Structures are given as C-alpha cells and as structure tokens.
C-alpha cells in the first residue's frame, strides 16, 4: 500500500519548568511575638539554620532551570520589516509591537486560562495593613512568616527570548544553532525539511499552495482550540494548586494543641509558673518544629520532579526547535518537520508541525527483475505494478517511473531470489544510437 496525499498537522505540548520560590521565618512562625519563647528557642541547636539553608537551594535552582531552558542563543535576532515567507502566514505567532509588552496572540490567550493566581510576589506591607475588609489568603499567611520571592526573569525577558528564537528559526533554518545565522529562503528550507524524511523536493515545489493552505488552516484551528473548550493546560495548574494547598495546610496546622493546655504561648505563660510551663512550652515547640520539617521535606521532593520536567523540556527544545529530529514520536505524531516555542507563566508550549500521509491504494510488488539472466534491484524505491506494466516509485509517495538502468543496480543471478518476476529494463544509450 502506498499513499497519494499527505496532511500537515499541528499539535501542542505543555511542560512546566519552574515553581514558586518560597521562604519562611522560624521565630515568627514558632514563637509569634513572645520574648520568653524566643529566648528558649536558642537551646534547640541549629534547626532554623538547616531549614533556611535547605529552602534556598530550591529558590536558586528555579532560576537555574529557567535560564538553562530559555537562554540558548547569544544574540537577539529580528524579523525583516517586509514579511512574506513563501506563502506561509506567521502573523498569529509573531510578536505584536502595537501592544503592552511584546506578547503574541497565542501567548496572550495562554496567560489568561491558567494564570488563576500570580501569588504574593512581594506585596508591600501598606497594601494590607488592616485597612478595609482585606485579610485575604496572602496577607494572612505573611503575618506568620511565610513569604514569596519574585523570579529573576520577568515575563518580558522570556517573551524576548522566545521571539528571538522564533525569528532565528524562520529566517535562518537550523544553521543558527551550530555557528552564526545564515539566511535562506523559506521555500528552500521546507525543501530540506521534506528531503530529510524520505521525500524528494519536486513533491514540495509542485504543491506549495496546498502546503501553505493546510498550515494556515491548522494554525487557525489550534488558535481556536485554546480559546474554546476546557483549556487543557492542567499540568501548569497542578503545581500552583499543590503549592497553595501545602501552604494552607501549614497555616492551619498552627492551631493544634499538641496535647497541651492551650495553643497560644501568651496564655500558657500567663496562667502557669515556669517550673510547669516549661513542659508545655517544650511540647508546643517540638510539635511545631516537626510540623515545619515535613513541609520542607515535601518541597525538596517536589523540586526533583520539577527539575526532571525542566531537563526534558530543555532537551526537547534543543533537539526539535534548533534542528530536525529523527527520533520516533519524540516531537508529535508523524514525521517531524519543525516546531515553534511559546511562553507560559510557569512553563513552555511547543507547536509541533508534522507530516501525515493519507489516501493509500493497493498494489503488487516483486523483489527483483530478472532481465537477460541478471537480478536488478531498486537503487532507492520499490517495484510496483498496476496490473500490466512495472514501475519504480518512492516509499512515502506515489510517483511511478519507467524501469531504467539509471535507477536500478544489478547483483548476481536470478535463480536464488524467491520472488523474482520477468520484465525488461531500458538502457538510455540504445534509443539515441
């Protein structure tokens, strides 16, 4: 069976690369404005130093992950003012200058579906100092010592990185990932991309308008899909949900009595003398320390998953955006052609463009052609026949050609191969002479 058409399909892939950076204050969480507890807490060694030191490696490695994923080009390329890329229409993904920042349309759609909460990325004390109703989740947590640090790279810088990458991969092919950018027409680049996956160039050069129309229809469909439906960017929401829920659990775990008289330091110190208040205070301190250690442990565990996802994203980006990949099913379903990166609040989004054949038809084959007592094998292709005459075609497209000594090579005799048939091969030397 051999196909006749083909279909250009555009897919999507979402991968988180970072999570929120958090910090904790030991004394404010444990004691909470009490000098006696603060003085007594110095007798437990270096637990707070351990926690503060463990909660900084995660914060630094988040920035490391973002830098290693996005920063892969030394220069910042730009598209020419005149835009005509061989009939393709890239206006849906190119940056829009007549807008705040330089986000494109797809990115603008993406930063609305999943950006449910941007968290308290360092909000000032005057924002909620007890004025009005206020007292939301962020402000209540801040008064217990739990804070949130801001990321190193703002969204504008990430947008600039993605724009530079996309402009470079359009205007120079894959040559900008090896050395310096080398310009080349887009049609002559799609010719290379097709020639990579077992298909000649005359297939593209004679079907350019169809390719352009299919690509434009696919990009319109992918634009509509994100805006409509349930917006499947769920892997970028689970991280935020887990972080917020862990913080909420840590806050709620402050009211447990831990088998003591009361859950507040001041009442215990006021209602009891130190000889018996020591036991209650020790019980509360050890309970809260054990409560605090588990949160650090879970965060340290989740950092490994985030790091593995970031490493996978970096590998996919390097091997699919900066060049063509021959690995099966690594980037999309089908034969890979080229992909584009897009930004997300806590991740990256790829738009893989693939090649899918269609409209197959039935045929019959033969391993060789015994003519003049010699077995002729196809140099590159396959023997087929519609029922009367034999032809040589490709493997991924139907394009019959007459049997010739040019596209066949002789090897051995024709009495050893199992399925030989009989036919004639034409030598181009004879007809002219």
């Amino acid at each position: 069976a051999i196909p006749t058409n083909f279909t250009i399909s555009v897919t999507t892939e979402i991968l988180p690369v970072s999570m929120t950076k958090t910090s904790v204050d030991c004394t404010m969480y444990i004691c909470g404005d009490s000098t006696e507890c603060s003085n007594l807490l110095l007798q437990y060694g270096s637990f707070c130093t351990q926690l503060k030191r463990a909660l900084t490696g995660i914060a630094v490695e988040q920035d490391k992950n973002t830098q290693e994923v996005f920063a892969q080009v030394k220069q910042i390329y730009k598209t020419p003012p005149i835009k005509y890329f061989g009939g393709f229409n890239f206006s849906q993904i190119l940056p829009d200058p007549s807008k705040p920042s330089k986000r494109s349309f797809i990115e603008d759609l993406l930063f609305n579906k999943v950006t449910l909460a941007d968290a308290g990325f360092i909000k000032q004390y005057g924002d909620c100092l007890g004025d009005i109703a206020a007292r939301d989740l962020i402000c209540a947590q801040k008064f217990k010592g739990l804070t949130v640090l801001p990321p190193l790279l703002t969204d504008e810088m990430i947008a600039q990185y993605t724009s530079a990458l996309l402009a470079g991969t359009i205007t120079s092919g894959w040559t900008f990932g090896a050395g310096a950018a080398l310009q080349i027409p887009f049609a002559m680049q799609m010719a290379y991309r097709f020639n990579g996956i077992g298909v000649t160039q005359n297939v593209l050069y004679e079907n350019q308008k169809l390719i352009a129309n299919q690509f434009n229809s696919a990009i319109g469909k992918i634009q509509d899909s994100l805006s409509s439906t349930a917006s499947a960017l769920g892997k970028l929401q689970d991280v935020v949900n887990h972080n917020a829920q862990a913080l909420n659990t840590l806050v709620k775990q402050l009211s447990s009595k831990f088998g003591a008289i009361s859950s507040v330091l001041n009442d215990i110190f006021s209602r009891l003398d130190p000889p018996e208040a020591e036991v209650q205070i020790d019980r509360l301190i050890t309970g809260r320390l054990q409560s605090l250690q588990t949160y650090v442990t879970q965060q340290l565990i989740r950092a490994a998953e985030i790091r593995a996802s970031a490493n996978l994203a970096a590998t996919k980006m390097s091997e699919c955006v900066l060049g063509q990949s021959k690995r099966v099913d690594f980037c999309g379903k089908g034969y890979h052609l080229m992909s584009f990166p897009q930004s997300a609040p806590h991740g990256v989004v790829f738009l893989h463009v693939t090649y899918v054949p269609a409209q197959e038809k039935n045929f019959t084959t033969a391993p060789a052609i015994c003519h003049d007592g010699k077995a002729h094998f196809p140099r590159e292709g396959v023997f087929v026949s519609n029922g009367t005459h034999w032809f040589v075609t490709q493997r991924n497209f139907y394009e019959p050609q007459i049997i010739t000594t040019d596209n066949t090579f002789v090897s051995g005799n024709c009495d050893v191969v199992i399925g030989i048939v009989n036919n004639t091969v034409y030598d181009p030397l004879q007809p002219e002479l």
């Binding site: 804070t147 190193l152 600039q160």
Partner: protein, 89 residues
C-alpha cells in the same frame, strides 16, 4: 526586601528597630525595585551582563578608583537583524 521605602527603614533614630546598625545605612542612595527597595547602590542606565542577581530583572556589580556598587538592568544579549531575502543564500 519585601517593604516599601516610605521612611520605614530609619524607623525614627533606629533605636526602636531590631537591627542596631548606623543611621548611615538607612540614609544613602535610595532605589526602589519590585523585590524591595535597595540602599547604598547607584542606578545606571546602561545594561551589562548579570553579576550579582537581585530579582525582577535587576543585577548589581562592583565597577569603576573603583566606585561603589552599581545596580542596573540585565541585558539579554546583543542585537543582530538577519538580512533575509527571497533570492539570497
């Protein structure tokens, strides 16, 4: 970090504040960032590579005798527009 400037680092004579540092550390070159407003580093317009990250796309470095710490905004990279044409290679 985490606080508006709004005169609060001084906190009146610094004797009622937890740190016991000199009032000079509260009055100096004042710059406001997104991660909290910084004291003691001058702001420069030009952009260099990041040396000591601060947050929200702000970096600091010790550069010229050598002057004090300078806080700037980091530069992603150089600029290079590819001369793209439809009959050129």
């Amino acid at each position: 970090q985490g606080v508006n400037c709004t005169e609060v680092p001084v906190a009146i004579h610094a004797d009622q504040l937890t740190p016991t540092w000199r009032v000079y550390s509260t009055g100096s070159n004042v710059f406001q960032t997104r991660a909290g407003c910084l004291i003691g580093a001058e702001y420069v317009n030009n952009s260099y590579e990041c040396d000591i990250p601060i947050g929200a796309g702000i970096c600091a470095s010790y550069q010229t005798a050598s002057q004090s710490i300078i806080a700037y905004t980091m530069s992603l990279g150089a600029e290079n527009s590819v001369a793209y044409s439809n009959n050129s290679i």
